[PDB]
Amino acid sequence: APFYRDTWVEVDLDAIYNNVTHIKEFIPSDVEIFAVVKGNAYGHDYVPVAKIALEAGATRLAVAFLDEALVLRRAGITAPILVLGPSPPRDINVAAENDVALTVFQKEWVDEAIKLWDGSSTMKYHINFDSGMGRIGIRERKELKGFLKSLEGAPFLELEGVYTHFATADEVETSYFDKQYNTFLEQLSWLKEFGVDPKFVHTANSAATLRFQGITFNAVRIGIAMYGLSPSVEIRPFLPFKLEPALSLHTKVAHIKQVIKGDGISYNVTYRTKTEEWIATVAIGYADGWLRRLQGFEVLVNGKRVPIVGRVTMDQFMIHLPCEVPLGTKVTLIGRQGDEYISATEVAEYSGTINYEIITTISFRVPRIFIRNGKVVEVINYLNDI
Amino acid sequence: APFYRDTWVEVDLDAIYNNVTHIKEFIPSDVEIFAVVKGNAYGHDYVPVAKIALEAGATRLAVAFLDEALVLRRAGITAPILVLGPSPPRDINVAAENDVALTVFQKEWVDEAIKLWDGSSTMKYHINFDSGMGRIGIRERKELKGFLKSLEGAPFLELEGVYTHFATADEVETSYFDKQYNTFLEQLSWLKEFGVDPKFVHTANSAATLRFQGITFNAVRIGIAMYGLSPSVEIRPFLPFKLEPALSLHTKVAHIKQVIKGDGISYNVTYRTKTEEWIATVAIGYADGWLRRLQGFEVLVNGKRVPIVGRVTMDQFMIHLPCEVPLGTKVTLIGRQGDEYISATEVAEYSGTINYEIITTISFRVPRIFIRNGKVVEVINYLNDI
C-alpha cells in the first residue's frame, strides 16, 4: 500500500507473463518451467513474480535459500519450490514441514540430517551435479557412491530430481558448454549404474534453453529471460524471440536550482559548475542500490539524457539539466522516456558489472508498483512490513 | 527470529552504546545528539540502533525519508524523528499524524502543502540551508524571503529547527569547511533579519563533531562514528578517541572440495586452478550486497586471508584455501578472526568505494544478530516479515 517518497520500481506483469508464455511455446510441450525468483525475484519481488509466472504456465519455483521459499509459502503459494543454493543440515525438518525441496549432494549433510531429523518428516531433495560450474554439487563417481551410501541410513530423504548448471551458456563459442553437457551425461550414467532413477532432470538456464537442442530434459530453470533481459550482450543477436523488459526504475525532481559558475556539488566538491547551471536533486542513492560508481551516468528527464554530477549520496543524487523543469518531473533511471531507453545492461556496463546485479540490488526500501493491462494492480512497500 | 542460512550480520550493541557515550562525553553538556539511522541504520537495522543510541544518551533520531520514520514509530519509539532528505508535499498530514518532522525549504512545497493540508494537522519542519553541499536547502536571501512569505499562508507548519550540512569535514585541509561555516552564519543572519528565531540549530556530522570548535550549536547529527567507523582514512589519525566498530559480516563453509589442476570455477571460467586446489563455497553473493567487484578480495578463514576466486554469483562465492577445513567453518567478510581484522574500509578500498556504501548495502535478506554484554539479545530476519 502506501509509500511516502516519489522513488519507485515499476514491474510490468504483462511483460513477465508474455516472456514465460513465449518460452513455454518455444520449448517442447512436455518440458516444465521453473520460475527462478531468488534474490527478491531479481529485484522484481518474490511473490508477484511467482504468481504471474505460474499463471503464464510455469509449474515450479526456484529460490536461493530456505527463508526465500518461506516468503512464498506464507503468501499462499503451493507450487513446488526448490532451493538451488546450499543449505545447512539444520534445515531438514523445516523444509519438509513447508513442502520445500533442498539441493542435497554431500554424505556429510546426510549424516548430520540423520542426527537432526525429527523422526517423522519426509524431505524432498534434488541432486546437484557439478559438471564444470565449480560451485556446488557432486563431481566424481566415488564421491557419488559415498553419497548414495549415506542415503541408505536416511529413508526420510526422497529424491525429486537431478540437475546441473552451465557456466558459459551465454558465450557464443560453445566448447566449454559442450564439455559440461558430455560430463553431465556421464554423471547420469553413474546414477544409472548405481540403480538410481533420476526421476526428473533439468539443466538449462535462460541462455541454454533459448539456444541449444538436447538440453531441455524434463524442465528448464528460467530467471533473466522471464524478467525480459538478455543473459549477455553477445548472445542477444541470436535469441529466438524478443524479450520484454519487466522492470523500470523512476524518481522525481525533488529540488531544482540555478547554481552559479564555479560552485561545488556534493561531497569533496568533485564537481564544479562551469556556468550558471540548472542542478536538480532526486530522492534516490546508494542505500537504494544506486551506487556511487554511477556518478557521470546519464539518467532520463523529459526524454533527454542528462548526467549525474557530484558524488552520489546515501539517499540522493544531483543532475545537471540544460533547462529548468518543474518540481515533480519524472526522472527515469531504468526504462523509457520518449525515444530514449536505458536498460539495466547499459547501467551495468557503465558500472563495470552485469544486468543481473543492477536489478537484484535495488534495495528493499524502494517500493514496487505492479502493472497489469496498463493498470496498477498492486503496490508492495517492504518498509511497511518490518 | 529464525533464519535458515548460515550467513549473518553481527551488530555489537555495546560498541554503538560506547560510541554514543564517548561522543556525548566529548561534546558540551547542552548539545544534543541526533542518532542518524537512515539506510537501515547504515545496514545495522533501524530499530535496534535507534533504541541503543537513545539509551546511550542520544535524544533525537534522523532518517532519509518518511517511510523510515514510520518503521521507528511502529516499533514504539517516541523520540523526535527528523527526515533529512526531501519529501513530497503529499507527506504533510501523515508526517504530522506520526509526530515526524520534515525538512522543508521551498515556497513551492508550502504552496502545495496548503492545498493538500487536511485542515487539522500541525507539522513540524526544519529549514535546510545549503551552505555548499549543493544538494538540498535554501542558498539565497531572496529565496529565503519568498519561502518565509509563503509560510504566512501555512500556520499549520511550525519551525522546529534550522540546519546545514558539510561537504568536506572529512578532508584534512579545511578551507571549504571554513567557507561553509561563514556562509551559514550569513544565512542565520538573514533569518534574524526577517524576524525568525531558528530555535534549534545543528550543523555537524561525525567528522565535524569530532574535529572542530564552534560547530556544535544546539545539536550534532552522528551516523558513521556511532557505528564505530571513521568518516575517512585521512582524518582517522586525528580522531579524539578510539571508535568501536559495531558491524561484522559472517558466513560458513557450505561446500569444500579438491579441484584438479586446470579446472574452472564459476561463470565464464575466469578462474582456473594452477594445482589441485581446495575450493570452498559460501552462501553469500551479490543479491546480499557482496558484489562481483569483490572477486580477488581476501576473506578470513581460520584467521588466514584467503582469496575469492571466480565470479561472485547471486547467492554464492568460492574461496581458494591452502588446506581442507570442515563444513561449517566460519568465514569472516568484515570483522576479526584471531590477529586478522577486515574493516568495511578495507572492503571499500578494494571495491573503489567508501565504508558507508559497503555497510549500508548489506541486503535486507541477510539476518542481523544483536549482541549485548557478549550475549545474543535479539535476532531480526526481515524476510520473515514480508
Ligand SMILES: Cc1ncc(COP(=O)(O)O)c(CN[C@@H](C)P(=O)(O)O)c1O
Ligand atoms: C542453478 C541455477 N539455475 C538457473 C539460474 C537462472 O539463470 P538465468 O537468470 O540466466 O536464467 C540460476 C541463477 N543464475 C544467476 C542469478 P546466479 O548463478 O549468479 O545465482 C541458478 O543458480
Ligand SMILES: Cc1ncc(COP(=O)(O)O)c(CN[C@@H](C)P(=O)(O)O)c1O
Ligand atoms: C544532513 C545529514 N546530517 C547528518 C548526517 C550524519 O553524518 P555521518 O554519517 O557522516 O556522521 C548525514 C549523513 N548522510 C551521509 C552519510 P549521505 O549524504 O551519504 O546520506 C546527513 O545527510
Ligand SMILES: [Cl-]
Ligand atoms: Cl550450481
Ligand SMILES: [Cl-]
Ligand atoms: Cl543536505
Ligand SMILES: [Cl-]
Ligand atoms: Cl576548531
Ligand SMILES: [Mg+2]
Ligand atoms: Mg549397499
Ligand SMILES: [Mg+2]
Ligand atoms: Mg576433470
Ligand SMILES: [Mg+2]
Ligand atoms: Mg569455525
